Design an enzyme around this catalytic site. Structure first.
Site: not given
Lengths: 198, 4
Positions: A36, A63, A141, A143, A159
């Site tokens: 993502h 993801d 942030g 991720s 994720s």
């Protein structure tokens, strides 16, 4: 730039994410991150400087993504933990109940345990299936960042989570956290990547 | 839960 799990990188001069793990694919250097975070060919920057581009990604459904780096980058078998480092030793998947930590540019290095596997997240964009849930906290942030055991076994990449209005789930008890990560093993075999270890 |  030195590529260490946990550190900040930007995507097309706009969103931020965190590096998951240094990997190679033959002579190409790259790092695995969350799907993502960017679309294929999005420009990644670390510290204002272009380090590589999104080579492939799948989001939603799964993801996952990996960014191919220019050869100037230095891949390191390490994940940030404050001013220290955790060495990446391998990718043995830990079982539920096992303790695990994660590293990212927003909340830093946080630990907790694995609470469940094969969770579906229903994000605005669509469901993502097969995620492992831990109760270590995290924030916007984080991720793409590393989930690793203290023992140095790479578990996956950040994720999503049940974010609260303060931008993280660090101010609610561990019992109420659902921090989800994408397993590393499927990403490694899907792109034919090998993890950098030390 | 939201992405991230």
């Amino acid at each position: 730039a030195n590529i260490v799990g946990g550190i900040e990188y930007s995507i097309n001069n706009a969103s931020l994410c965190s590096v998951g793990f240094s990997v190679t694919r033959g002579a190409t250097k790259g790092f695995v991150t969350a799907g993502h975070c960017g679309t294929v060919n999005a420009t990644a920057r670390i510290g204002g400087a272009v380090v590589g581009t999104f080579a492939a990604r799948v989001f939603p459904g799964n993801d996952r993504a990996w960014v191919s780096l220019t050869s100037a980058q230095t891949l390191l078998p390490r994940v940030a933990n404050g001013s220290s480092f955790v060495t990446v030793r391998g990718s043995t998947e830990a079982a539920v109940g096992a303790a695990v930590c994660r590293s990212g540019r927003t909340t830093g290095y946080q630990c907790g345990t694995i609470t469940a596997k094969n969770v579906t997240a229903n994000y605005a964009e669509g469901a993502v299936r097969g995620l492992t849930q831990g109760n270590a906290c995290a924030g916007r942030g984080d991720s793409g960042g590393s989930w690793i055991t203290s023992a140095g076994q790479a578990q996956g990449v950040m994720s999503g989570l049940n974010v609260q209005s303060n931008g993280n789930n660090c101010g609610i008890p561990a019992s109420q956290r659902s921090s989800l990560f994408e397993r590393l093993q499927p990403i490694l075999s899907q792109y034919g990547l090998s993890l950098v270890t030390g | 839960a939201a992405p991230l």
